[PDB]
Symmetry: D2
Subunit: 269 residues, 4 copies
């Protein structure tokens, strides 16, 4: 009686990443509409809405529910933007496109990973996947995408994925501008950093990306994993109280990266 | 403490579907190289090999091992053909393409489902998925694909999937021709047959496909699930003893389909 | 001084195919907005517009101009449907998608040809091409697509292309229903009909498609080339006067097909 | 009698770009097999051949002819690499893939442009297009691709296109190593350089790419347009005599770029 091949293993996550929350207002037009521990930002304009990230694949219905609470019908969603195309951020994109008619704008690296459904990941292989989706517009570094007069600027910050992107826009609160920076992850979870044949310039890209994050226009920083920027979505009006600056987020990420690099030289993860 | 969204659920299968077996010769050039309960046929020519189906995603390494036992190095695999693009038959195609340089030939319906990784299935939704892969050649009904002088003919038999295909070729044994028919599944597992908005002509297609299977050139029938044609790969040289004819396979499938249709009218699965 | 390789040759067409016209009303909601000799139908609903075909690639701006004359802003175009994915009918689809955010719904055969930009055509090779575009929804035979409460039904009629489709919907005029049938081309221009290795069942498909066209619900027939159904868009309110029935269109196409088949047997085009 | 829309215009080129030539040996394994004025490099190994660029779409048959003269049958072509995905360098890729079974390896930017057939170009729009093709392997900056033991290293040099790549490998001649650098174009033909909304960091990318080219391992430089590196393929064994170094090629390109930038500030092309 010899061993059969192993069964496929599902991508399972902490319960808080799947815990629905009601819409939490970030600025006049901008709302967190994902789960307690995964960001999905809805930006509402007079000419339709923009969604930045959707979380896990199973979050599609919840996102549509929260859009409805905000007055956004499915067909009112015009545009989906992404931080990076891993299953816990781009998971429901294919379903959202089918149910809303929204288009996706992303850089070429994010587009190719999204079209693979996250398979053949440089570090994860086929372990963390989701339904594939197509990008409808390819964007370049620094390119501006505008919906309802609100301009979103892309800032490439490769490392966590080759296509990792920060998005910036200026909202308002109390009559004053609020420069929002939605910066992507700077983690390298389980990654081989040095001499990686699938990503030879990984270290150089991360190092440049720390600098890119430090330089973002940033009155208020948000991140795909809210804990990375010290947000606590579950506490409502105090959710943003402890939020990091872009400088502090980059500094923390670089210290962690440097320590991980030294541990890899020392033979451990 | 309210319920979080459910975790993703992996596509799990009976252990026998994942139980490796050594190559089992079907005819002079044709070998079963999959698992005990999933067909993957290797056809070896003087100018490279053809693979018809690969089974589950986790079978890629085993298939390459069996190819090596047959004298087929990875780069010797020229062509992948498919019965249908469900995860338990097309599962390892993307990985095989990357590791062998083989091309995929398939009809348009199979190509679109394969490129989705089986997501947005007409009946399964996103429940049964696999790494997406691209077809390199689109084939039409009755089209002949030739490798090393061996001609493979496609016979469309829509129903189980819109792109379901039977493949026929003539091998030899004991100096005599053996017309092999690799006919696709004719099951409708859990499908809504009547008035299905995603497949309005489902019943008409199945009915035509029973006739197509009856008419195949067929000295020896094989099926993606070997039990459907009464093969038992685990018993070696007796594996083919009880194999059905194409007529008998079509008849059994049609009786099951008609009974399921009546049960659906009677309100049950 | 030996001959260089030939220059690329552009797909050039009769001037009337490129001659802009103002919107011509077909029924209460339905307008011809293409050129004098290429159909592009705009169907306007309370929840956005549908475009059936766009003509040649250079027609994108003209279509948007005519949409504006009808009160349809670019973002109001929700859906693009196609008769078949040749350059003179799907030509501007990629550009329209980028400028409107519309989605494309098409069958798998049309989707694969559209994604090739018409290249590797079964009969034309690479001679007649256009910017590639992706389908966003794959439709099956008989499937209903609804926008603003108006239901469009797909009727597959393979032959002219494998993915050739007739679209039907019911509009109104003078308080009475008008069953509109937009039937695809039934021509085989320069095609090898018999024993075509790239389309082995071509004759069988055309023969079935003549029957499909005869059976369409049809108070008013329109065709991608208006002359094929005896429309004359240039004469305004008399444009539809001489229009054929579906029965007469199918009969004329079948007689032409049978004559061409006999000429092919007799060695001529 | 008002003007019809303009006819489509073919991409026409100088006759020398389409003038076939016999294979010209560059090093022990490496041959120029394109036309007098467009590079297409064949690298022949014990385990199959690599093609770097193919020229214009109409060059497919000529390339296959020259491969045959070199002893390379169609199925012996294993891999296609590209400098950049414009019609005059990637033109015949789709056809070559269909006729050889070769795979394409390219970066994400090149993959997305190739899959568009060069349409929606950042600078050319839809004016310069070719049959779309899919990449089979996505490569990263500095990644090594190996065929028959010969290692090809990718060096990203964005500017002329976002995906512009230099490829390096070490061949031999007279028992000594020859480090070959196939560097992409550094021209900006008709491009808006400053404040280009579709390429906001164009100038920064070109400036970094001049430095990348200067730093390439380079005993012998070749370029997609041979005149850019002072090759003259038509003079046979003297073809390489006047070839530039990488330093000189970068310097000439940067001086031209700086002059064009000043002219753009001065309001001219
Ligand atoms: C695989 C692609 C996304 S990358 C997809 O979902 N498509 C491509 C064509 C239509 C639609 C579908 O199959 O439903
Ligand atoms: C959180 C990341 C995605 S940003 C992830 O999925 N990881 C991190 C490494 C492994 C894998 C997992 O959770 O299983
Ligand atoms: C999503 C497609 C298959 S349908 C894919 O895997 N591609 C497309 C381009 C290259 C390669 C890859 O991303 O590795
Ligand atoms: C055997 C089929 C594929 S041919 C399958 O995966 N089924 C049948 C219906 C449900 C699902 C499952 O096993 O979970
Ligand atoms: C080639 C595809 C259509 S079949 C395309 O245009 N795409 C695919 C991703 C984004 C967009 C683009 O490149 O502009
Ligand atoms: C009218 C058809 C498309 S429906 C066409 O483009 N043809 C017909 C055959 C040749 C080619 C041409 O006009 O050059
Ligand atoms: C459009 C793609 C290349 S990007 C293509 O040619 N395909 C995709 C599937 C098969 C093959 C074909 O249609 O011939
Ligand atoms: C030589 C370049 C491609 S590298 C080209 O095609 N150009 C340069 C600008 C215009 C266009 C043309 O020849 O028409
Ligand atoms: Zn991630
Ligand atoms: Zn994550
Ligand atoms: Zn199945
Ligand atoms: Zn199965
Ligand atoms: Zn046509
Ligand atoms: Zn036409
Ligand atoms: Zn170029
Ligand atoms: Zn060029």
């Amino acid at each position: 009686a010899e061993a059969p091949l192993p069964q496929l293993r599902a991508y399972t996550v902490d319960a808080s990443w799947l815990q629905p929350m009601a819409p939490l207002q970030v600025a006049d037009h901008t709302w967190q509409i994902g789960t307690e521990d995964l960001t999905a930002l809805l930006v509402q304009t007079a000419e339709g809405a923009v969604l930045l990230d959707g979380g896990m694949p199973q979050m599609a219905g919840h996102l549509l529910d929260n859009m409805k609470l905000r007055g956004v019908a499915p067909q009112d969603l015009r545009l989906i933007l992404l931080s990076h195309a891993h299953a816990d951020h781009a998971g429901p994109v294919a379903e959202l496109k089918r149910r809303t008619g929204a288009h996706v704008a992303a850089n070429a690296e994010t587009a190719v990973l999204l079209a693979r459904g996250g398979s053949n990941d440089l570090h994860f292989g086929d372990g963390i996947t989701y339904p594939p989706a197509s990008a409808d517009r390819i964007i370049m570094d620094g390119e501006v995408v505008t919906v309802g007069g609100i301009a979103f600027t892309a800032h490439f910050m490769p490392g966590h994925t080759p296509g990792s992107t920060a998005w910036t826009w200026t909202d308002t609160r109390d009559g004053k501008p609020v420069r929002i920076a939605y910066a992507d992850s700077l983690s390298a979870p389980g990654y081989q950093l040095k001499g990686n044949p699938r990503y030879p310039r990984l270290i150089e890209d991360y190092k440049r990306s720390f600098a890119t994050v430090r330089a973002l226009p940033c009155d208020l920083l948000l991140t795909p994993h809210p804990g990375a920027s010290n947000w606590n979505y579950a506490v409502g009006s105090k959710a943003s109280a402890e939020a990091l600056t872009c400088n502090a987020y980059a500094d923390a990420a670089e210290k962690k990266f440097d320590a991980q690099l030294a541990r890899e030289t020392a033979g451990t993860r």
